[PDB]
Structure 1
Amino acid sequence: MLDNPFIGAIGYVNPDWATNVISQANQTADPTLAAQMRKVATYSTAVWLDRIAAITAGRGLRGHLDEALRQMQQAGQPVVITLVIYDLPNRDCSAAASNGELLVAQNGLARYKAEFIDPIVAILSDPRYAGLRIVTIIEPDSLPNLVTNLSIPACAEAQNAYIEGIRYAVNRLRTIPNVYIYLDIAHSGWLGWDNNFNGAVNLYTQVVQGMDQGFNSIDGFITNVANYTPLEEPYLPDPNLTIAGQPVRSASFYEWNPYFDELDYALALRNAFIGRGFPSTIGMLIDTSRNGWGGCSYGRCRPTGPSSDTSSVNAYVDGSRVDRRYHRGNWCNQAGGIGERPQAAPRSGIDAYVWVKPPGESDGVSQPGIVDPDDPNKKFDPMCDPNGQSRYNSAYPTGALPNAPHAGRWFPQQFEILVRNAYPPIQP
């Protein structure tokens, strides 16, 4: 097994995603923007397995792997393909409504094992795929809920199913020598606060210790999956900097969380885990699909330096931060921009920047009353209401873009915004 599966391999390019990008480019009048979109279509994105049907629907898992083989033959070098394993029972428990098809109280764990993990493992075990590097991102929005959201019944009731399900997934995937396993661990705006950070380190250490190969059962962790938090806040590098008598982390946007960005957070987690007994061979991934924050939205353009307004900590932070969301918890259909392109080993301790969430795919439908004919499990979430307030702090708007289709479906208005706001900007 390699120390870093992203070194010496090219990323899988999903033709089904690229087809959507190119279709929009062909319908885009501005020749420069259209050319930028065509360039975007050449980049590598992860394949999401978000329900049992996803295993065989369309080209299916085998189809993507066969396509990866073709790209590998064509390129004359290894291909690394990223798969998102995302179907735990009581999935996304902190939402009032789960889009997940499996329920803990109705044989969810057992079905997760037999009908989701098992057939995935059988396909990945096919000797035909031995030449690939297969990266599996394990269950976004699962374990972090057990740190912060146990007050929510759906989360508290799912605890042991999450633990046993993730252990089962990793234990089975570890039997396949070219599978590289990264556990999802949210983002800095979720687990950055001291109590959450320590709670997460404790929890993930317990979860991994109980796996068959203990601390050797995984290859590392991933942050920022499907979120927008920047890699770096270059103009807020010191969370303890005093402005008007107070440290900048005390700003309303941060609420005393000292982690303003994903590099600080991912590297701190990695060091903490190594301190708990994980081998230094672990590496972190960060999803940079939508965290560039170029262009302008939410009443601001990207800052080009620390704010000149040192009159209050809020004025300073709000004028200095690259993440210009109204509130850090605003996760749905944000007017952000594409971030750093997928790349291997950008920093010591970081295995790669990856595009896990595929840019252009919706985070959720923007209003209730509309049922997805292909998945009646997908349900409107008020965080996606362009006219609504955040459920985490009602003083702030959701920031969600209007006219969004159901989650996973192509959202051309956001895709155009994501390309225009790319940082670094897309070059045709």
Structure 2
Amino acid sequence: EKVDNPFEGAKLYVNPVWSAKAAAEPGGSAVANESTAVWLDRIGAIEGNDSPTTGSMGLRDHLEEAVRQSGGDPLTIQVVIYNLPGRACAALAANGELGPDELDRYKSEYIDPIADIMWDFADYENLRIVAIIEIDSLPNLVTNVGGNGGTELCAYMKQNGGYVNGVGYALRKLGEIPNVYNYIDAAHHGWIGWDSNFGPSVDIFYEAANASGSTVDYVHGFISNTANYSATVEPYLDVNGTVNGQLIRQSKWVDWNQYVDELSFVQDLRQALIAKGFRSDIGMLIDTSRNGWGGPNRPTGPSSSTDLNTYVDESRIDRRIHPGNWCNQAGAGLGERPTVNPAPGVDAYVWVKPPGESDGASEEIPNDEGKGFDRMCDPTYQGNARNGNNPSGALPNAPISGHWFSAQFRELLANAYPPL
């Protein structure tokens, strides 16, 4: 009874809090009426906490504003569910208020009040709520547990079931509401694109969909590239191709990945998920908030070079040093503006990470948000295992994650692709 694609035939919510911030930047009015997802990054964001990350509007305020903007007609608002116990276990930049052992509080004081408020809007037939479920969670339990270079926190979160059970609980509690459309976060190709990660990610997504009373029927789809920068399509790069003998996969950039972009990745992932037992009518989202890679540095065509790495590095639109470089990435541009069904199996391109909001502090900044200083956000950081021992590529003088980052907004705007 829920529509096949909640983005289809709907006006998109414009967040007034985000809109004002964009509009106050030079030239920012050009994108200030774009739809971005509303993040519930703290229990305080539910009622509203006048914070640097969520401002003066609580969830009810946003849904009232969504109803107002709708004018009676179909309108879709995206709400990011983002407060798991031991949140973001592989990193420190977006750690949260709920510790590893606080699943009970996640249920009672976070998911339950959210569900309560959403139920109050169930009488608006044309309001659609897209719930984006727990970014940067489950894939960590595949790639950051055991072996070498993992974290004890991720190991613990796998052991105690907090991520799997927390996700299943969100899926059921929100999914049983008539106008709520759940999308599970699915990392990105430069995370779980490899053979060793792909299948196990599929399995853990299925496990979470069946935890805490959930079934696959509470899952409308999956989102990739959330708050990341991976290219939607690499127009001059073929993952299966070859440069003068040497395979594309042998390049430093691709490094045996099954994929070079998000589109091929989510289309294959969609098929795997259906095969695993997810509904055949699931659809994929791609966060294109920051993946346009436009401006003067954008390749205008494939390289003429016959050397493998030279060809790949000159041909790729994603210009990062390493695909594992995730924080405040230097040179990034706004990607495709939100678009309905742009490609086979894709419900929408969307702006989930709101452009101009930081990925993390570039230094030690005191806060009550539970957020530490992650060195992957430090421009001077020389890397580790999970990035091939490379410089971080992160922008200097960055504020706490979610805080307004003028310099990043301005560069994203300048590097928009397609141009504005």
**Which TM class, normalised by the smaller chain length?**
over 0.9
Partner-residue secondary structure (3-state), 2:171 = helix
Matched, 1:248 2:248: yes
Residues in 2 aligned to 1:163 and 1:189: alpha-carbon distance in whole angstroms: 22
Q: Tell me which residue corresponds to 2:109.
A: 115
Residues in 1 aligned to 2:334 and 2:369: alpha-carbon distance in whole angstroms: 30
Matched, 1:12 2:13: yes
- Is residue 90–residue 102 contact of structure 1 (8 Å, CA) maintained in 2? yes
Q: Aligned pair in 2 of structure 1 residues 364, 96: CA closer, same or farther (>3 Å)?
A: closer
Query: CA shift at 1:253, angstroms?
Result: 1.2
Equivalent position to 1:418, from 401, 412, 419: 412
Query: CA shift at 1:306, angstroms?
Result: 1.2
Q: How does 1:325-404 map to 2 (within 5 A)?
A: 325-334=320-329, 335-368=331-364, 370-372=365-367, 375-391=368-384, 392-393=386-387, 395-404=389-398
Matched, 1:153 2:157: no
- Is residue 289–residue 357 contact of structure 1 (8 Å, CA) maintained in 2? yes
Q: Aligned pair in 2 of structure 1 residues 248, 356: CA closer, same or farther (>3 Å)?
A: same
Query: CA shift at 1:128, angstroms?
Result: 4.8
Equivalent position to 2:70, from 57, 69, 72: 72
Residues in 1 aligned to 2:202 and 2:82: alpha-carbon distance in whole angstroms: 22
Aligned letter for 1:54?
A
Q: Aligned pair in 2 of structure 1 residues 104, 47: CA closer, same or farther (>3 Å)?
A: same
Q: For residues 27-77 of structure 1, give each alpha carbon's deviation from its aligned partner in whole angstroms, at most 9, with x where no partner exists.
A: x3xxxxx2xx2120010000001111111122200000000011012xx52
Q: How does 1:275-354 map to 2 (within 5 A)?
A: 275-296=275-296, 301-311=297-307, 313-334=308-329, 335-354=331-350
Residues in 2 aligned to 1:14 and 1:96: alpha-carbon distance in whole angstroms: 27
Query: CA shift at 1:254, angstroms?
Result: 1.7
Matched, 1:182 2:183: yes
Matched, 1:261 2:261: yes
Q: Percent identity?
A: 55
Q: Tell me which residue corresponds to 2:99.
A: 103
Partner-residue secondary structure (3-state), 2:29 = helix
Aligned letter for 2:191?
W
Q: For residues 125-147 of structure 1, give each alpha carbon's deviation from its aligned partner in whole angstroms, at most 9, with x where no partner exists.
A: 00454431000000011100111
Q: For residues 103-153 of structure 1, give each alpha carbon's deviation from its aligned partner in whole angstroms, at most 9, with x where no partner exists.
A: 123xx1000000000000000000454431000000011100111111221
Q: For residues 82-104 of structure 1, give each alpha carbon's deviation from its aligned partner in whole angstroms, at most 9, with x where no partner exists.
A: 00000000111011575211112
Q: For residues 199-257 of structure 1, give each alpha carbon's deviation from its aligned partner in whole angstroms, at most 9, with x where no partner exists.
A: 11122123224464622121010000000001000101x21212243210111112110
Q: Tell me which residue corresponds to 2:270.
A: 270
Residues in 2 aligned to 1:282 and 1:394: alpha-carbon distance in whole angstroms: 35
Residues in 2 aligned to 1:279 and 1:348: alpha-carbon distance in whole angstroms: 16
Q: Tell me which residue corresponds to 2:194.
A: 193
Tell which deviates more after alignment, 89-98 or 194-203.
Answer: 89-98
Q: Aligned pair in 2 of structure 1 residues 148, 195: CA closer, same or farther (>3 Å)?
A: same
Structure 2: 5+ residue stretches without partners: 49-55
Partner-residue secondary structure (3-state), 2:24 = helix
Q: Tell me which residue corresponds to 1:22.
A: 23
Structure 1: 5+ residue stretches without partners: 29-33
Aligned letter for 1:398?
S
Q: For residues 281-310 of structure 1, give each alpha carbon's deviation from its aligned partner in whole angstroms, at most 9, with x where no partner exists.
A: 1000110000000014xxxx1111111111
Residues in 2 aligned to 1:90 and 1:389: alpha-carbon distance in whole angstroms: 26
Q: Tell me which residue corresponds to 1:56.
A: 47
- Is residue 93–residue 361 contact of structure 2 (8 Å, CA) maintained in 1? no
Partner-residue secondary structure (3-state), 2:167 = helix
- Is residue 211–residue 217 contact of structure 1 (8 Å, CA) maintained in 2? no
Partner-residue secondary structure (3-state), 2:30 = helix
- Is residue 289–residue 354 contact of structure 1 (8 Å, CA) maintained in 2? yes
Tell which deviates more after alignment, 41-50 or 327-336.
Answer: 327-336
Q: Tell me which residue corresponds to 2:52.
A: none
Residues in 1 aligned to 2:270 and 2:414: alpha-carbon distance in whole angstroms: 33
Partner-residue secondary structure (3-state), 1:286 = strand
Aligned letter for 1:146?
L
Equivalent position to 1:138, from 133, 139, 151: 133
User: TM-score normalized by structure 1?
Assistant: 0.91
Tell which deviates more after alignment, 221-230 or 275-284.
Answer: 275-284
Q: How does 1:159-178 map to 2 (within 5 A)?
A: 159=158, 160-178=161-179
Partner-residue secondary structure (3-state), 1:285 = strand
Residues in 2 aligned to 1:289 and 1:376: alpha-carbon distance in whole angstroms: 24
Query: CA shift at 1:389, angstroms?
Result: 1.7
Residues in 1 aligned to 2:396 and 2:370: alpha-carbon distance in whole angstroms: 21
How many residues align? The count is 403
Tell me the C-alpha RMSD between the 2 structures. 1.5
Q: Aligned pair in 2 of structure 1 residues 199, 339: CA closer, same or farther (>3 Å)?
A: same
Q: For residues 333-370 of structure 1, give each alpha carbon's deviation from its aligned partner in whole angstroms, at most 9, with x where no partner exists.
A: 112000000011111210001100000111111112x2
Query: CA shift at 1:395, angstroms?
Result: 3.7
Query: CA shift at 1:276, angstroms?
Result: 2.0
Residues in 1 aligned to 2:397 and 2:74: alpha-carbon distance in whole angstroms: 40
Q: Tell me which residue corresponds to 2:226.
A: 225
Q: How does 1:228-239 map to 2 (within 5 A)?
A: 228-236=229-237, 238-239=238-239
Residues in 2 aligned to 1:423 and 1:149: alpha-carbon distance in whole angstroms: 33
